[PDB]
Design a protein around this motif. Structure first.
Motif, mmCIF file in Angstrom:
data_model
loop_
_atom_site.group_PDB
_atom_site.id
_atom_site.type_symbol
_atom_site.label_atom_id
_atom_site.label_comp_id
_atom_site.label_asym_id
_atom_site.label_seq_id
_atom_site.Cartn_x
_atom_site.Cartn_y
_atom_site.Cartn_z
ATOM 1 N N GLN A 155 6.908 -10.128 -9.428
ATOM 2 C CA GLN A 155 7.196 -9.000 -10.049
ATOM 3 C C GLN A 155 5.712 -8.444 -10.397
ATOM 4 O O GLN A 155 4.920 -8.983 -11.380
ATOM 5 C CB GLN A 155 8.050 -9.076 -11.202
ATOM 6 N N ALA A 156 5.315 -7.270 -9.557
ATOM 7 C CA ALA A 156 4.371 -6.497 -10.115
ATOM 8 C C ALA A 156 4.646 -5.074 -10.322
ATOM 9 O O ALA A 156 5.519 -4.654 -9.885
ATOM 10 C CB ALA A 156 3.043 -6.720 -9.012
ATOM 11 N N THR A 157 3.910 -4.187 -10.901
ATOM 12 C CA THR A 157 4.291 -3.065 -10.896
ATOM 13 C C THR A 157 3.726 -2.164 -9.849
ATOM 14 O O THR A 157 2.652 -2.412 -9.277
ATOM 15 C CB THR A 157 3.173 -2.342 -12.469
ATOM 16 N N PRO A 158 4.534 -0.920 -9.617
ATOM 17 C CA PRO A 158 4.224 -0.264 -8.298
ATOM 18 C C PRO A 158 2.682 0.098 -8.351
ATOM 19 O O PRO A 158 2.015 0.404 -7.556
ATOM 20 C CB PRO A 158 5.002 0.933 -8.471
ATOM 21 N N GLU A 159 2.263 0.213 -9.593
ATOM 22 C CA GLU A 159 0.800 0.553 -9.719
ATOM 23 C C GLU A 159 -0.032 -0.386 -9.548
ATOM 24 O O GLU A 159 -1.290 -0.298 -8.750
ATOM 25 C CB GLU A 159 0.415 1.261 -10.924
ATOM 26 N N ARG A 164 -3.357 -3.174 -4.724
ATOM 27 C CA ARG A 164 -3.728 -4.187 -3.958
ATOM 28 C C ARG A 164 -3.483 -3.670 -2.424
ATOM 29 O O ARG A 164 -4.164 -4.492 -1.688
ATOM 30 C CB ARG A 164 -2.560 -5.101 -4.406
ATOM 31 N N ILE A 165 -2.923 -2.427 -2.312
ATOM 32 C CA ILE A 165 -3.041 -1.833 -0.966
ATOM 33 C C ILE A 165 -4.469 -1.355 -0.926
ATOM 34 O O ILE A 165 -4.961 -1.331 0.338
ATOM 35 C CB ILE A 165 -1.986 -0.804 -0.703
ATOM 36 N N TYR A 166 -4.799 -0.688 -1.864
ATOM 37 C CA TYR A 166 -6.189 -0.132 -2.332
ATOM 38 C C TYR A 166 -7.162 -1.583 -1.542
ATOM 39 O O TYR A 166 -7.670 -1.432 -0.543
ATOM 40 C CB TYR A 166 -6.304 -0.030 -3.606
ATOM 41 N N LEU A 167 -6.767 -2.605 -2.409
ATOM 42 C CA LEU A 167 -7.792 -3.696 -2.449
ATOM 43 C C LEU A 167 -7.728 -4.355 -1.025
ATOM 44 O O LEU A 167 -8.537 -5.192 -0.605
ATOM 45 C CB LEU A 167 -7.809 -4.768 -3.503
ATOM 46 N N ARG A 168 -6.440 -4.281 -0.239
ATOM 47 C CA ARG A 168 -6.345 -5.072 1.079
ATOM 48 C C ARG A 168 -6.885 -4.402 2.446
ATOM 49 O O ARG A 168 -7.593 -5.106 3.023
ATOM 50 C CB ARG A 168 -4.823 -5.185 1.357
ATOM 51 N N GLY A 169 -6.716 -3.034 2.499
ATOM 52 C CA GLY A 169 -7.591 -2.490 3.647
ATOM 53 C C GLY A 169 -7.127 -1.947 4.803
ATOM 54 O O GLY A 169 -7.521 -1.313 5.816
ATOM 55 N N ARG A 170 -5.623 -2.072 4.847
ATOM 56 C CA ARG A 170 -4.678 -1.748 6.081
ATOM 57 C C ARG A 170 -4.726 -0.038 6.213
ATOM 58 O O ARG A 170 -4.172 0.597 5.163
ATOM 59 C CB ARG A 170 -3.460 -2.031 6.116
ATOM 60 N N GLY A 175 -1.752 5.203 3.201
ATOM 61 C CA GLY A 175 -1.158 6.554 2.860
ATOM 62 C C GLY A 175 0.325 6.304 2.346
ATOM 63 O O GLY A 175 1.007 7.386 2.484
ATOM 64 N N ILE A 176 0.843 4.958 2.138
ATOM 65 C CA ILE A 176 1.921 4.851 1.432
ATOM 66 C C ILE A 176 1.828 5.326 -0.121
ATOM 67 O O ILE A 176 0.660 4.995 -0.796
ATOM 68 C CB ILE A 176 2.464 3.390 1.209
ATOM 69 N N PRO A 177 2.471 6.541 -0.599
ATOM 70 C CA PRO A 177 2.272 7.112 -1.848
ATOM 71 C C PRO A 177 3.037 6.145 -2.898
ATOM 72 O O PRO A 177 3.974 5.078 -2.582
ATOM 73 C CB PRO A 177 2.964 8.132 -1.897
ATOM 74 N N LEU A 178 2.672 6.395 -4.144
ATOM 75 C CA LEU A 178 3.158 5.408 -5.296
ATOM 76 C C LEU A 178 4.933 5.710 -5.290
ATOM 77 O O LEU A 178 5.532 4.821 -5.707
ATOM 78 C CB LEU A 178 2.811 6.010 -6.657
#
Ligand SMILES: O=c1ccn([C@@H]2O[C@H](COP(=O)(O)OP(=O)(O)O)[C@@H](O)[C@H]2O)c(=O)[nH]1
Ligand SMILES: O=c1ccn([C@@H]2O[C@H](COP(=O)(O)OP(=O)(O)O)[C@@H](O)[C@H]2O)c(=O)[nH]1
Ligand SMILES: Nc1nc(=O)n([C@H]2C[C@H](O)[C@@H](CO)O2)cc1Br
Ligand SMILES: Nc1nc(=O)n([C@H]2C[C@H](O)[C@@H](CO)O2)cc1Br
Lengths: 236, 234
Positions: A155-159, A164-170, A175-178
């Motif tokens: 369990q992590a927050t949507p934010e 982590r999508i930020y930090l991942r790089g794909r 383009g996946i919005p919150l």
């Protein structure tokens, strides 16, 4: 099967592949089945007919979800069922206390992603009720060796995930919005935290859930997470 | 597996169901599995029935969109119809034979392949569909595997007339051309045996061809005699 089966469930970029890459090494008795759609994403920085197929429909789902959601979901689940069987039939044989950790489950495919696409109108009634019928059948015919012994919910927050999508790089994923991350979050919470959600899978009602807060970065400080996994795993 | 499994193959309105219903009446050891999609045509709601009707209509209305979805559901619905028959029927029979109205090979090698060659399934759909089909029939296809095939050969012009005789609204717009594509795939697979296929055994499966261009609803004895003769060779 003497093998116990635990799914690792959580939002996009919760840290599942990370956590499971940590657990695999902590026991010769601990084994892992990664998500096949996890391998369909990354670039041509590898051959494979499943991956070319997956590469293609994933990207097609990004461009036109309401045309490709059924085909995608159909194939993602096939791919997962196949890969779960192969690890069952291949791994952990000489293990005294074997634990197989699944990177998600047939149930996240359905009650998270497929359910969301329908509710997001990218599947019509017909596509959704066909998939559900296909899913009941696929899983009551093969998936019987796969019934879960328990579930670990990261369990992590949507934010956190967005970061982590930020930090991942794909690319696709940037383009996946919150709001979409938020939708899956709510659905994980109702499935796993509250255990409100009914599933057409009877024994699920009574499977043990372990909820772990993963907001804090756990790469260099995971020992307490694993301590809770180890305790959870003894009650099983 | 002591139940012998026989598929009846042929084009739309060649006479498959008619011949199947004739067969069923003749013997206690003989049972049929009617094809799912045939039942999805009529009103005249089960979940399958409901999705089935809808998806056939969508299929007609826009085949480039709905073909993959239709073909998976058709085939899935057929596997479960045949699996239920086999574990249900002919338990006491001495010489049991279950006749399938069509099979999963015609699902893939006539219909799905035809839709691929019509540009109604793009390449990844055809590839994904082949992958899913191969996997299952190499998983389950087992106790469904055939002992023989009976091919009811009619001309496309015969089927066109029979379609028109049978009077299903939907089918009234099926052009001879489409019937003629379907004809060629059958002749190809079942008579000349040139078609290649991912199920090796089907290379040595015996085939009986029957010419059903003549009406047989009241004159079928010679058709039935060939079936019995066939059945003894298997
Ligand atoms: O505690 C954590 C969990 C994960 N990550 C990073 O967050 C991103 C997403 O993690 P993961 O690949 O495990 O995503 P998931 O498998 O859940 O989709 C990756 O770049 C990880 O390196 C991190 O830095 N600390
Ligand atoms: O010898 C025959 C066989 C068939 N039919 C008719 O032709 C139509 C098509 O037959 P059927 O539905 O059995 O064909 P299938 O689609 O099952 O191959 C139906 O109205 C039948 O009653 C006929 O008049 N004479
Ligand atoms: N069954 C699934 N359906 C999906 O739509 N995804 C999506 C969400 C995300 O964009 C990517 C996972 O890498 O694919 C994943 C799975 Br698993
Ligand atoms: N596997 C199949 N694919 C099809 O498109 N049909 C078509 C043939 C006809 O045009 C309509 C009614 O059977 O559905 C049938 C089968 Br069986």
């Amino acid at each position: 099967t003497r093998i116990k089966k635990i799914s690792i469930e959580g939002n996009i970029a919760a840290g599942k592949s990370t956590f499971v890459n940590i657990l695999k090494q902590l026991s010769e008795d601990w084994e892992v089945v990664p998500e096949p759609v996890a391998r369909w994403s990354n670039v041509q920085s590898e051959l494979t007919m499943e991956q070319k197929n997956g590469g293609n429909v994933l990207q097609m789902m990004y461009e036109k979800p309401e045309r490709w959601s059924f085909t995608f979901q159909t194939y993602a689940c096939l791919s997962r069922i196949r890969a779960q069987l192969a690890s069952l039939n291949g791994k952990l044989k000489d293990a005294e206390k074997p634990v197989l950790f699944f990177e998600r489950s047939v149930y996240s495919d359905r009650y998270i992603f497929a359910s969301n696409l329908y509710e997001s109108e990218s599947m019509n009634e017909t596509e959704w009720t066909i998939y559900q019928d296909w899913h009941d059948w696929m899983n009551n015919q093969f998936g019987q060796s796969l019934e879960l012994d328990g579930i670990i919910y990261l369990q992590a927050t949507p934010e956190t995930c967005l970061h982590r999508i930020y930090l991942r790089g794909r690319n696709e994923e940037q383009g996946i919005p919150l709001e979409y991350l938020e939708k899956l979050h709510y659905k994980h919470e109702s499935w796993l935290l509250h255990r409100t959600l009914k599933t057409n899978f009877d024994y699920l009602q009574e499977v043990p859930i372990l909820t772990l807060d993963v907001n804090e970065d756990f790469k260099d400080k995971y020992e307490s997470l694993v301590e809770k996994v180890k305790e959870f795993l003894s009650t099983l």
